């Protein structure tokens, strides 16, 4: 099997895990923690940057020597994207924006760009892709996002057959814009969240790539608790001592979190669920100068 | 054949070196 | 023998104690200070416009390593591993194996340079002046992996700078 | 009374404050503990030779010296005379590029800021005698255990003796600045008062010696290379205070002067190591050309040369203050045990008792005047 | 006194080849002495001495336009000088390559490259040995 | 003044070694055999203590 | 067409303005300090460049590791590194702060400051002589030169 | 015979009670250190961890050995109490960053050449 | 050093000394970069005969 | 004797002899050997419990005065059943003369602190504690010197690993600098450089 | 004399060049892979062989103490040619 992609060491930073990845859009809020749990084991990681190499001075600690190489493609481009995934054996997509741009809207940015990264990823030999898209992603979606979401998932699913997708809710974390979001605010009691943990989806990840019969599955990765949005919000609040982006934010944001009870979760990958109030207080810290809401289940 | 050439103080010695300490009066009382 | 560095006795007449007074009331070692200031305001500076002007050097100057080559072109390293053995930070990597025509030659020279000391024991202890530390010293790097020199980086050093490493050598040979 | 703590050479200072005063002060240090002594123990005496440039980085060859010269007692050779009058040289210009740092540095951390530049030209020049003799400007690594690397080049002591014939006035300069100013006077005079007895109890050496009126130095009592064939005098201190040690160091300065002139008049011919290939290796030619010479070279450049065993203090009067090594050789050519005693550990040990009843800018002062390097004080 | 001063600062301007050749190397170089000319380079560097300056400032170089690949105007850096001139240039030797040339051998570089680092010409290092440990390969033929 | 206590000495708790490099370590004490290639016999003259091998592998920069 | 004229010579602008004003601070670690002091020395003189000597940490833009990073130094250096505003660039000097130098195969130093923060500047020696020094500063300023900000975020 | 000089205690019994008050010191300080250092454990947490690191050493039969680790134990309390650590210095007692390494057969098996 | 009379006056009366006498900056007056060959005699253990290493 | 051989001082050597000799005269209760090296140097070895007399005594005593103490270090031999050796050395102005003096102990027995007699020795006696484990009693404050805050184990004995046990690294998910199990991209290479064919008849062993 | 591999890397004086399997190859896309152009086998294979006249031959690599040690070299084997052992030159008796 290509012996040179047999794990070697103890799985510390200068080990072998035999894993070579190309994380697209690893500047991002994922990826930062994905690049982190792939280089601490000594997986060689291919960053695909199109920022400048300032944005991604960050992630050169995260690996051993050689362990991490940049590289600059365009979204726009094949042969930049083939040139990135040739010799990858894992080819992990995180690409996202949240907004418009006159250069990319939701379409290329959910439909076209994972569509040519399956694609060549599929015609370059490459074991094992995961694609990451919205938990409330459905064709019938109001907004475009989340329908842009799924009519992505379905063309990379058609590209590339093993792909595994991985369908995250409202994940939490340090820079996250979901906590931070709400308390830059200084509407509800019909709305459900069920918030993720960022080191949860990392680790889900993770084992994913691990994982050996997680080909062709699809995951939602969801928290251990539903929050009604108005408590989730005076929660937040709280934490933070504080008395209580256009257009799509707030429609998706007003959307309640859907439930799949028949994909598997974070529970099959072998990880439990970090309640949000342990880690509300490591997020919030940070916007100051207790009674956790009450959950549905 | 060759004769032995190394760094070597010139024949005589060097100069002397001053090394006290040589802080003048202006003058004015 | 041994000085006295402060027991001198002030006098005490009318004339010192006055003159201490007109120090103490009108500032005249501070205007001194002040006219030693000056006075070093008005000389030229020893700045040197880098890089245009370099800072002096010498023969026996070690800074960018290099592998050298005999006047036939063929390298002057015999794998004998004594650079590897004194090498006090264990910044040299050595593997050798006989070569298609028998020669003892490395198939593996690495030096760490940001494990070097840059002492010059290597270049000291090879004896077939293969390995040499040259006089480049503006090889700053924008990575670490590129501080960490193989066979070839090292024998296009040794090509690169042969003409001014040979000259150096030239000059201080007679010393070694 | 609140404790505050002054962190990140580098140093972690915690002290209690009453007020203006410090009631006590506690140095932590640590913060360039390389572990350089169990380092030691993995290489050979030549291996090991670079470290003591690390050690004091300031006093280089000072410190190359000192292992030297506990590696020549062990090992029961002496060097040639050229060998030992071209160390008490590059020791000379050692302590005058030493003093002009203390002298620089500590005037800087008190404000003054320009004789540090108009000293460090000098310093520069200095370094330059360095770089030619030796091939580095810092870690030169030129004494050895047998003598000296390299012989001078041909050109080197008109240049030494050219810069040392203009370095008075560099000195008077420097005395203008700060001798008899009176903000000067009043940073250091009567600060860091330390008496002889609690000076010798605590296990001062140097200047913290001399400058409380004790009459002690290595290079006279106890002198190890040509010491005693070169004439100076040993400036003495009558206060005790950090003015009184200021004094001292220009003192140093100017009989450094002396010696060096001395050492360039009565530079001696011959050779420059141990005529004695089983300790010193052989010349180039003559390992190129002769097989004595070949496999000489070989083995004191693979394994290196085996030292009989037994255990030596040897101690020198480096700028510092006494720099000693503590040797445990057990017959091989790795040394068993090298414990490196530096003065800085003792002074900064010194300073909770010198900085009693001061005010919080003293405190500086006092570690100026100590002239604390902790690259000696962590090893 | 004052007007010599000013007559030497007018014979300095006129020394650059005019106004033009002023403002060039007072905006290139920061410094606008004259000194006679050592040697040319094949880069198009040129080598200038002055034995009345002190020490250091007695020998420079004037930086090329266009070096191999790149525009050199404001971009220069010491890494640009051939080992021969930077033998000379650092104050290593007296004698220029003009009047002594270094040896000449048919491996040395015919063309002196600069610092790569930062540029798809920067060096990558890698392993030079060859594989160890040769793995068994199964037959292709079915074994019943 | 004297504990006179009875108890095989251990200051494993005391050493600071991790846990695993303990009960999992086996050492070898032994007296080198001499070195074929010479007839001099002056290195088995001690006694040297070693621990087992344990995995290395190839760094996949530089190698 | 007019837009990314403008936007190209604003960033070519604000780079000139940064380059040609880099306040350092330097941890004074170990012996390598000594020659960043020789780079501030009358005949080097880093001023010139605008380059000033010892920036306060609160207004600095460039970091020079000059010297050995321990086990107990890492978090200090880390938490000043987290301090720094803005545009930071960090520049390891010497084999010490590179790799860890003569001291790597030591329990209680750092192999390298790249394992507490990100270098955009390497200078090998040991020391560097102050002429090296110099040049990796100029190397800094010229990858400086090279970045553009701006025109990333018009193509964004 | 068997007979050595002491360091604090003479029998087992006064090493038990120089444990227990060691035990009480850090079971006083844990809360106050989680607020202090701005933790983010809970008290119950940082306890648990404390009667962790005391049952480490619950095999000693050595008074000299139990004394000499209470002696250590009172350095680092002291330590903490000064504030003279970092953050990042008391949380080396959890090795949070570090991946979970398994025990069974198999999965050493599985993983690598360690036993 | 170049510099005018009126300077060096100014200077020299500033400082309270002569500068000219002793300049900081080098000049000519310093050893030339290019030196002939040297010799570097032998040590005293050369010899041909008498010289058994035993005794020495 | 040639100019190659350091020559031999017998004054010197006569004189450390004599006053040696007058030591163990003088303190029959902790004195155990007295020896002078070829190169003139004194070292006395005593039992572990006479440090704060003899010490005192050379102090204090008109004849020695040994008021300096220049170096407290202590030498690691695990073949001995006192692993650790203390070292103290002495010198004395008013004679110009250096001293040494030599003490045993292990692990779990305890060395008396001559900070009562020395002051230097404070930081000193820490340092041993940092570096060896030697544990010194009655000290004003005996902690770690040297080792970073929390160090396990005690590095300059001659079975600690060069490397140590862990090694310092930061960590974006956490935030912070951690430490995790050491991991050498180059292994520290071993060289055995003893060779055979003893070098010095002298130090001949017996073959037992 | 540089080679080229078949999947078009250069071949180094070592025989070294990653197959068309081996991942590390991307560590050289959009950079470039040092190797040296001069390859001392081939240089030293051109260089010719001495003839001296007699049966023990000298060799110190040129130079004098700038060279390598001086050994000597038998060349009563008339089938092939002495070969210094730091140098690589070649030396041959004058058969005929
Ligand atoms: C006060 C009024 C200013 C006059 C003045 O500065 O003359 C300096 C003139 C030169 O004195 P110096 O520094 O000892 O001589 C240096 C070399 O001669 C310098 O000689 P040089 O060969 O380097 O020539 C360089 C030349 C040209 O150099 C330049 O390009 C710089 C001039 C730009 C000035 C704006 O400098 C000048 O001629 C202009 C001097 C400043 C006048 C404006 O001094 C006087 O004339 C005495 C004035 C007394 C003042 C107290
Ligand atoms: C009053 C209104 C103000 C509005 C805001 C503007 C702020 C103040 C306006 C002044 C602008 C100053 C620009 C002048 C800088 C030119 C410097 C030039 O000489 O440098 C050279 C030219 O370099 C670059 O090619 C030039 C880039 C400068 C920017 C070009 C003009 C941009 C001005 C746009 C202003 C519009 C403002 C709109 C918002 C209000 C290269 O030097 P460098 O490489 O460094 O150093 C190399 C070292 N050497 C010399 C020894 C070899
Ligand atoms: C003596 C005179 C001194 C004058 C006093 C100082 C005046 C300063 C003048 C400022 C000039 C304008 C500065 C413009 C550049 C600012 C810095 C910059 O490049 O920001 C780029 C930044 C990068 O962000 P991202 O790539 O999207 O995300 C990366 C992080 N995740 O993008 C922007 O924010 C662009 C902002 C729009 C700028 C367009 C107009 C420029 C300003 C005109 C002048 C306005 C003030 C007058
Ligand atoms: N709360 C959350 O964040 C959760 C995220 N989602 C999905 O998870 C994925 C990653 O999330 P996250 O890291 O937070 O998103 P980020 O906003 O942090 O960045 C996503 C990455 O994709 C890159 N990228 C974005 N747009 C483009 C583009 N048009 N062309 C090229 N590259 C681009 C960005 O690089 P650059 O710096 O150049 O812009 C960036 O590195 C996304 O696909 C998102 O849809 C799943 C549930 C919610
Ligand atoms: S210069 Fe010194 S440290 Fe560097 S490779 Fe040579 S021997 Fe090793
Ligand atoms: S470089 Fe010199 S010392 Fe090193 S292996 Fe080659 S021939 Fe031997
Ligand atoms: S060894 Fe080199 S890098 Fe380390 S402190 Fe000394 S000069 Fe600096
Ligand atoms: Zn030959």
Redesign the pocket.
Same mark, same amino acid.
């Given at each position: 099997l290509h012996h040179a992609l047999i794990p070697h060491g103890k799985g510390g930073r200068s080990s072998v895990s035999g894993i070579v990845a190309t994380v697209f859009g690893a500047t991002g809020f994922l990826g930062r923690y994905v690049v982190n749990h792939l280089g601490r084991m000594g997986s060689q990681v291919i960053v695909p940057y199109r920022c400048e190499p300032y944005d991604t001075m960050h992630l050169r600690p995260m690996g051993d020597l050689g362990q991490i190489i940049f590289m600059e493609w365009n979204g726009k481009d094949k042969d930049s994207i083939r040139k990135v995934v040739e010799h990858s054996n894992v080819v992990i997509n995180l690409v996202g924006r949240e907004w418009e741009t006159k250069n990319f809207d939701f379409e290329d940015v959910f439909v076209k760009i994972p569509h040519a990264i399956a694609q060549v990823s599929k015609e370059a030999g490459v074991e094992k892709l995961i694609h990451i898209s919205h938990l409330n992603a459905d064709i019938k979606s109001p907004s475009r996002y989340l329908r842009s979401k799924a009519v992505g998932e379905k063309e990379v699913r058609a590209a590339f057959p093993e792909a595994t997708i991985i369908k995250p809710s409202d994940i939490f974390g340090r820079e996250d814009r979901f906590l931070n979001y709400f308390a830059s605010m200084r509407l509800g009691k019909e709305t459900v969240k069920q918030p993720v943990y960022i080191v949860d989806v990392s680790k889900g990840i993770i084992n994913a790539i691990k994982d050996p019969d997680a080909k062709g599955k699809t995951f939602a990765f969801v928290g251990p608790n539903r929050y009604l949005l108005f408590d989730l919000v005076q929660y937040i609040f709280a934490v933070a001592y504080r008395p209580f982006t256009t257009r799509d934010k707030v429609e998706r944001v007003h959307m309640s979190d859907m439930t799949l009870p028949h994909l598997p979760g974070l529970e099959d990958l072998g990880i439990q669920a970090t309640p949000l109030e342990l880690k509300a207080i490591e997020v919030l810290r940070r916007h100051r100068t207790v009674k956790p809401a009450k959950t549905v289940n | 054949a060759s004769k032995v050439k190394q760094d070597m103080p010139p024949p005589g010695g060097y100069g002397p070196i001053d090394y006290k300490r040589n802080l003048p009066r202006r003058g004015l009382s | 023998t041994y000085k006295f560095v402060n027991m001198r006795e002030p006098s005490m007449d009318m004339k010192s104690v006055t003159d201490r007074a007109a120090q103490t009331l009108l500032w005249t070692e501070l205007v001194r200070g002040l006219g030693m200031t000056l006075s070093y305001l008005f000389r030229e500076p020893a700045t040197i416009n880098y890089p245009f002007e370099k800072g002096p050097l010498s023969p026996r100057f070690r800074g960018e390593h290099a592998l050298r080559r005999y006047p036939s072109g063929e390298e002057r390293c015999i794998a004998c591993k004594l650079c590897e053995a004194v090498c006090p930070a264990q910044a040299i990597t050595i593997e050798a194996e006989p070569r298609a025509d028998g020669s003892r030659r490395t198939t593996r020279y690495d030096i760490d340079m940001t494990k070097c000391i840059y002492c010059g024991f290597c270049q000291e202890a090879c004896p077939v002046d293969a390995i040499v530390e040259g006089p480049n010293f503006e090889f700053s790097t924008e990575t670490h992996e590129e501080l960490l020199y193989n066979k070839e980086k090292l024998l296009n050093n040794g090509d690169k700078w042969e003409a001014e490493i040979a000259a150096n050598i030239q000059a201080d040979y007679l010393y070694r | 009374n609140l404790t505050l703590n002054f962190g990140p050479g580098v140093l972690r200072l915690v002290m209690e404050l009453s007020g203006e005063m410090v009631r006590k002060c506690d140095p932590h240090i640590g913060l360039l503990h390389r572990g350089t002594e169990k380092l030691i123990e993995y290489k050979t005496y030549l291996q090991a030779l670079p470290y003591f440039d690390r050690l004091d980085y300031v006093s280089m060859m000072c410190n190359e010296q000192a292992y030297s010269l506990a590696v020549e007692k062990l090992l029961n050779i002496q060097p040639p005379p050229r060998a030992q009058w071209i160390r008490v040289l590059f020791g000379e210009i050692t302590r005058l590029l030493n003093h002009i740092m203390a002298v620089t540095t500590h005037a800087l951390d008190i404000g003054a800021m320009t004789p540090f530049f108009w000293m460090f030209e000098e310093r520069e020049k200095m370094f330059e005698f360095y770089e030619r003799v030796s091939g580095a400007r810092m870690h030169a690594a030129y004494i050895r255990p047998g003598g000296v690397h390299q012989d001078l080049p041909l050109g080197l002591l008109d240049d030494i003796y050219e810069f040392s014939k203009n370095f008075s006035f560099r000195i008077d300069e420097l005395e203008e600045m700060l001798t008899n100013n009176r903000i000067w006077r009043n940073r250091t005079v009567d600060i860091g008062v330390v008496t002889a007895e609690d000076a010798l109890n605590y296990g001062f050496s140097g200047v913290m010696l001399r400058g409380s009126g004790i009459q002690w130095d290595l290079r006279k009592t106890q002198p190890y290379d040509v010491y005693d064939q070169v004439e100076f005098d040993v400036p003495i201190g009558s206060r005790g205070d950090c003015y009184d040690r200021y004094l001292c160091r220009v003192e140093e300065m100017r009989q450094s002067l002396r010696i060096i002139s001395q050492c360039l008049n009565k530079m001696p011919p011959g050779e420059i190591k141990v005529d004695d290939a089983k300790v010193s290796p052989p010349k180039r030619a003559e390992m190129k050309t002769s097989m004595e010479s070949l496999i000489h070279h070989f083995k004191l450049y693979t394994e290196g040369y085996q030292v009989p065993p037994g255990a030596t203090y040897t101690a020198i009067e480096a700028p510092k203050g006494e720099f000693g090594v503590y040797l445990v050789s057990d017959g091989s050519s790795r040394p068993y045990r090298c414990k490196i005693k530096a003065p800085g550990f003792a002074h900064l040990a010194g300073l909770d008792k010198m900085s009693k009843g001061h005010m919080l800018a003293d405190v500086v002062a006092i570690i100026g005047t100590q002239d604390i390097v902790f690259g000696e004080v962590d090893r | 006194e004052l007007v010599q001063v000013l007559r030497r600062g007018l014979q300095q301007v006129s020394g650059h080849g005019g106004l033009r050749g002023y403002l060039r190397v007072l905006? &290139?170089?920061?410094d606008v002495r004259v000194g006679t000319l050592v040697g040319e380079d094949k880069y198009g560097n040129k080598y200038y001495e002055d034995n009345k300056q002190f020490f250091g400032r007695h020998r420079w170089v004037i930086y090329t336009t266009e070096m191999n690949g790149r525009d050199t105007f @404001?971009?220069?850096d010491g890494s640009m000088v051939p080992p021969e001139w930077h033998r000379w240039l650092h104050c290593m030797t007296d004698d220029p390559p003009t009047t002594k040339p270094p040896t000449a051998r048919k491996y040395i570089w015919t063309n002196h490259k600069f610092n790569v680092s930062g540029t798809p010409q920067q060096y990558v290092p890698y392993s030079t040995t060859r594989k160890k440990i040769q793995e068994w390969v199964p037959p292709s033929t079915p074994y019943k | 003044q004297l504990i006179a206590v009875d108890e095989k000495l251990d200051i494993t708790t005391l050493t600071g070694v991790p846990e695993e490099h303990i009960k999992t370590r086996k050492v070898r004490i032994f007296v080198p055999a001499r070195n074929n290639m010479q007839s001099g016999v002056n290195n088995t003259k001690k006694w040297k203590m070693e621990f087992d091998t344990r995995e290395r592998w190839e760094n996949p920069l530089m190698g | 067409s007019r837009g990314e004229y403008v936007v190209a #010579?604003?960033d070519?602008?604000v780079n @000139?303005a940064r &380059?040609?004003s880099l306040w350092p601070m330097t941890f004074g670690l170990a012996c390598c300090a000594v020659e960043m002091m020789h780079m501030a020395a009358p005949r080097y003189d880093m001023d010139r460049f605008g380059v000033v000597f010892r920036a306060s940490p609160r207004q600095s833009d460039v970091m020079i590791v000059a010297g050995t990073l321990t086990n107990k130094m890492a978090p200090a250096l880390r938490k000043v590194y987290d301090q720094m505003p803005e545009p930071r660039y960090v520049v390891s000097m010497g084999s010490c702060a590179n790799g860890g130098g003569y001291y790597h195969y030591s329990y209680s130093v750092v192999r390298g400051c790249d394992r507490i923060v990100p270098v955009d500047i390497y200078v090998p020696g040991c020391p560097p002589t102050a002429e090296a020094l110099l040049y990796g500063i100029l190397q800094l300023q010229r990858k400086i #030169?090279r970045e553009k900000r701006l025109r990333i975020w018009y193509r964004r | 015979g068997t007979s050595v000089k002491p360091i604090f205690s003479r029998d087992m019994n006064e090493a038990k009670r120089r444990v227990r008050e060691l035990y009480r010191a850090w079971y006083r300080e844990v809360p106050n250190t989680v607020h202090l250092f701005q933790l983010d454990i809970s008290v119950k947490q940082g306890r648990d961890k404390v009667r962790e690191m005391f049952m480490k050493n619950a095999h000693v039969t050595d008074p000299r050995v139990v004394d000499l680790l209470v002696i250590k134990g009172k350095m680092e309390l002291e330590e903490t109490i000064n504030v003279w650590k970092q953050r990042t210095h008391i949380m080396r007692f959890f090795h949070e960053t570090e991946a979970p390494r398994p025990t069974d057969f198999l999965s050493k098996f599985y993983v690598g050449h360690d036993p | 050093a170049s510099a005018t009379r009126v300077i060096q006056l100014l200077r020299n009366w500033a400082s309270g000394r002569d500068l000219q006498a002793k300049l900081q900056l080098r000049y000519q007056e310093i050893s030339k970069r290019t030196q002939p060959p040297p010799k570097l005699p032998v040590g005293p253990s050369h010899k041909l005969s008498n010289n058994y290493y035993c005794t020495r | 004797t040639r100019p190659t051989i350091r020559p031999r001082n017998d004054v010197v050597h006569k004189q450390l002899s004599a006053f040696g000799q007058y030591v163990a005269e003088i303190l029959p209760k902790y004195v155990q050997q007295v020896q002078v090296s070829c190169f003139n140097e004194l070292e006395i070895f005593i039992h572990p419990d006479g440090v704060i007399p003899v010490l005192t005594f050379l102090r204090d005593h008109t004849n020695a005065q040994f008021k300096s103490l220049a170096d407290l270090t202590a030498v690691d031999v695990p073949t001995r059943q006192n692993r650790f050796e203390i070292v103290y050395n002495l010198l004395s102005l008013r004679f110009n003369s250096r001293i040494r003096v030599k003490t045993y102990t292990d692990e779990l027995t305890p060395i008396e602190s001559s900070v009562t007699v020395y002051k230097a020795a404070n930081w000193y006696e820490r340092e041993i504690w940092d570096m060896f484990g030697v544990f010194f009693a009655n000290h004003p404050d005996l902690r770690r010197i040297l080792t970073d805050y929390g160090f396990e184990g005690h590095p300059f004995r001659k079975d600690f690993p060069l490397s140590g046990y862990v090694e310092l690294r930061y960590d974006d998910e956490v935030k912070r600098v951690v430490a995790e199990p050491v991991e050498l991209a180059q292994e520290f290479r071993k060289f055995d450089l003893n060779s055979p064919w003893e070098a010095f008849p002298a130090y001949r062993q017996p073959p037992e | 004399g540089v080679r080229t591999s078949p999947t078009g890397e250069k071949v180094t004086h070592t025989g070294q060049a990653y197959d068309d399997g081996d991942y590390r190859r991307v560590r050289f896309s959009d950079r470039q892979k040092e190797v040296n152009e001069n390859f001392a086998i081939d240089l030293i294979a051109e260089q010719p062989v001495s003839e001296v006249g007699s049966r023990v031959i000298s060799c110190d690599g040129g130079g004098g103490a700038l060279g390598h040690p001086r050994v000597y070299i038998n060349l009563d084997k008339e089938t092939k040619t002495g070969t210094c052992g730091y140098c690589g030159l070649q030396f041959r008796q004058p058969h005929h």
């Open positions: - | - | - | - | 905006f &290139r170089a920061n @404001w971009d220069v | - | #010579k604003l070519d602008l @000139w &380059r040609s #030169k | - | - | - | -």
